[PDB]
Amino acid sequence: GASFQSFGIPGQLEVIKKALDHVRVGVVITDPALEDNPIVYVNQGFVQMTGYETEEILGKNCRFLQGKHTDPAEVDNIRTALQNKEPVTVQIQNYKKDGTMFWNELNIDPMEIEDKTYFVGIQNDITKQKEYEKLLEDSLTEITALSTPIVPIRNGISALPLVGNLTEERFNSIVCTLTNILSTSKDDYLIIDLSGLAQVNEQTADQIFKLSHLLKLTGTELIITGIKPELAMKMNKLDANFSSLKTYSNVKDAVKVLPIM
Amino acid sequence: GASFQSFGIPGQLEVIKKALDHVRVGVVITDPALEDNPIVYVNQGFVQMTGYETEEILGKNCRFLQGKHTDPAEVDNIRTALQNKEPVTVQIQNYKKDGTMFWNELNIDPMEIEDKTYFVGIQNDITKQKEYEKLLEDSLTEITALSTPIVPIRNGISALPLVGNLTEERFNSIVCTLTNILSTSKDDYLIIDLSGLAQVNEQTADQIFKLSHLLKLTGTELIITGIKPELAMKMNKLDANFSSLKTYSNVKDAVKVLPIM
Ligand SMILES: Cc1cc2nc3c(=O)[nH]c(=O)nc-3n(C[C@H](O)[C@H](O)[C@H](O)COP(=O)(O)O)c2cc1C
Numbered sequence: 001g002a003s004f005q006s007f008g009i010p011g012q013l014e015v016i017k018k019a020l021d022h023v024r025v026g027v028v029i030t031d032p033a034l035e036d037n038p039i040v041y042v043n044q045g046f047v048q049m050t051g052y053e054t055e056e057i058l059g060k061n062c063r064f065l066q067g068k069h070t071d072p073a074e075v076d077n078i079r080t081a082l083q084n085k086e087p088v089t090v091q092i093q094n095y096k097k098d099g100t101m102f103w104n105e106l107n108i109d110p111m112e113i114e115d116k117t118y119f120v121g122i123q124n125d126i127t128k129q130k131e132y133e134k135l136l137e138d139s140l141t142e143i144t145a146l147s148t149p150i151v152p153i154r155n156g157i158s159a160l161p162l163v164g165n166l167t168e169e170r171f172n173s174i175v176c177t178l179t180n181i182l183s184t185s186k187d188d189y190l191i192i193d194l195s196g197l198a199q200v201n202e203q204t205a206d207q208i209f210k211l212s213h214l215l216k217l218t219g220t221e222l223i224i225t226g227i228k229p230e231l232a233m234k235m236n237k238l239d240a241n242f243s244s245l246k247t248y249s250n251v252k253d254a255v256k257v258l259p260i261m
Numbered sequence: 262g263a264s265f266q267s268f269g270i271p272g273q274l275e276v277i278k279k280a281l282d283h284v285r286v287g288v289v290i291t292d293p294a295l296e297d298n299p300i301v302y303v304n305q306g307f308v309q310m311t312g313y314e315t316e317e318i319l320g321k322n323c324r325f326l327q328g329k330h331t332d333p334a335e336v337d338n339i340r341t342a343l344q345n346k347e348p349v350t351v352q353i354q355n356y357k358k359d360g361t362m363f364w365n366e367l368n369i370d371p372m373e374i375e376d377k378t379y380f381v382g383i384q385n386d387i388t389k390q391k392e393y394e395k396l397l398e399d400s401l402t403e404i405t406a407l408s409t410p411i412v413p414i415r416n417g418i419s420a421l422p423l424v425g426n427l428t429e430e431r432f433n434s435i436v437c438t439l440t441n442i443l444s445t446s447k448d449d450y451l452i453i454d455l456s457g458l459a460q461v462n463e464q465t466a467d468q469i470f471k472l473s474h475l476l477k478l479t480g481t482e483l484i485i486t487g488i489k490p491e492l493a494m495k496m497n498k499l500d501a502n503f504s505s506l507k508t509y510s511n512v513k514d515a516v517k518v519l520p521i522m
């Protein structure tokens with residue numbers, strides 16, 4: 001904590017800055033001593049990361065970054081932590097000059113120098129990590145269509161059970177599957193298991209109806225199973241036709257009863 | 262590029278150093294002017310991250326970290342880049358003082374100052390990201406045992422098809438499934454589809470044989486399907502008994518033919 005051990009020399013200082021400039025990282029220095037704790041230290045890389053000019057950023061708080069996606073709970077945690085003068089690390093959504101939305105990790109830690117406080121903001125981009133997750137998702141997608149098991153039960157009997165919570169993102173795969181069903185028109189009976197699926201959405205019912213109509217024209221009976229009794233009662237009120245389509249408490253039970261003669 | 266704009270003051274310098282110390286990040290400064298470009302600038306956090314003392318690091322090249330897991334190709338790329346005085350980013354496995362292996366991302370970028378060259382080494386830990394992938398893998402594991410579908414074909418007939426490339430890690434789930442199969446001893450016929458699997462390993466054939474023996478005692482016929490004709494010819498040479506087990510070209514074909522009276 002001296003000019004001896006610290007090691008002055010302005011040449012050393014220039015080196016440290018260039019290194020920071022080479023890699024885009026958001027580190028800034030604020031001064032509580034000045035009004036509203038304004039930001040004094042800013043690197044060039046900051047501008048490229050936020051897309052904001054250095055002149056605008058200096059003299060103003062990173063408040064302008066906050067927008068609709070900004071999580072008030074995180075904001076509140078930060079406010080608490082400064083009052084507690086204790087370090088805090090949180091992730092908070094932020095907006096650029098062009099409105100681009102990106103995630104920005106913020107780490108704040110108090111300093112005690114010359115009996116004076118200090119604040120530092122560190123911003124670490126989560127984008128590289130997001131790209132990694134996206135790569136994984138793409139792999140899952142190719143994998144998901146492939147898993148899409150096919151296994152005819154018998155001759156003219158086919159089944160396509162669904163397991164998991166059907167999200168809107170996942171729904172695209174299903175609509176595409178409609179084209180495949182036309183190819184499988186040969187199978188007279190199709191059995192769909194909804195038992196895997198925890199719950200069934202109302203929008204889903206509309207999909208079931210469209211399929212039965214297309215299937216009826218093509219001459220393919222549709223069977224629905226894994227329907228909860230409570231759900232069926234609700235369905236009856238909506239339309240007497242719902243009861244028209246054979247319903248089995250479970251897949252094993254439908255399969256066992258199916259054959260009889 | 263001057264003491265004016267740079268902004269001297271040793272107090273500012275101590276501020277920058279503590280902030281680096283608070284968060285463990287491997288940044289070091291080397292001097293090509295001296296012999297063998299020795300490292301002069303090192304932070305305390307470096308020691309905790311590498312588990313090496315500052316006195317031993319300073320004066321020596323990061324070459325000691327390299328070990329068995331070190332990738333020569335990555336080393337050669339670095340050597341090429343320095344000669345080409347162009348920045349290079351690579352990921353290279355390293356070793357600690359206790360022999361703990363970890364991944365170390367290295368970024369090198371040349372600097373031109375006062376008509377002198379300078380080299381900087383940046384190390385970023387991929388441990389956090391590793392933990393994240395591990396969390397994902399745990400989910401997949403719970404999900405994988407759960408996905409393990411169960412769908413009896415009929416009364417007495419059950420099938421458990423395999424899809425995907427059977428790794429050694431994956432093999433643990435299968436051995437565990439052996440216990441479940443005992444519970445399923447009720448089903449007289451068990452059909453296993455190897456068609457989904459791209460290839461079959463010779464070690465696998467040992468597993469099939471053990472299963473048929475246990476199954477035969479319990480009184481449970483075992484049917485293998487999806488076996489490639491080329492593979493069957495190879496199997497015939499190893500043991501006639503291989504033919505002994507019924508083999509179908511496909512699952513659909515075996516299912517259709519199955520019933521006949
Ligand atoms: C050092 C420091 C850096 C900050 N950096 C960011 C930031 O990059 N992004 C963000 O959303 N909030 C950041 N904040 C929070 C805001 O700058 C500000 O402290 C908060 O919005 C409360 O200020 P206000 O009263 O003007 O809203 C930072 C806070 C401090 C103290």
Ligand SMILES: Cc1cc2nc3c(=O)[nH]c(=O)nc-3n(C[C@H](O)[C@H](O)[C@H](O)COP(=O)(O)O)c2cc1C
Binds near residue numbers: 355369384
């Ligand atoms: C600035 C700088 C930092 C380096 N840091 C590391 C490091 O942390 N880990 C690593 O495996 N290699 C690192 N290297 C590579 C070695 O330090 C060294 O350059 C390389 O092994 C060739 O040196 P040698 O001829 O002694 O093998 C670094 C190289 C430079 C130039």
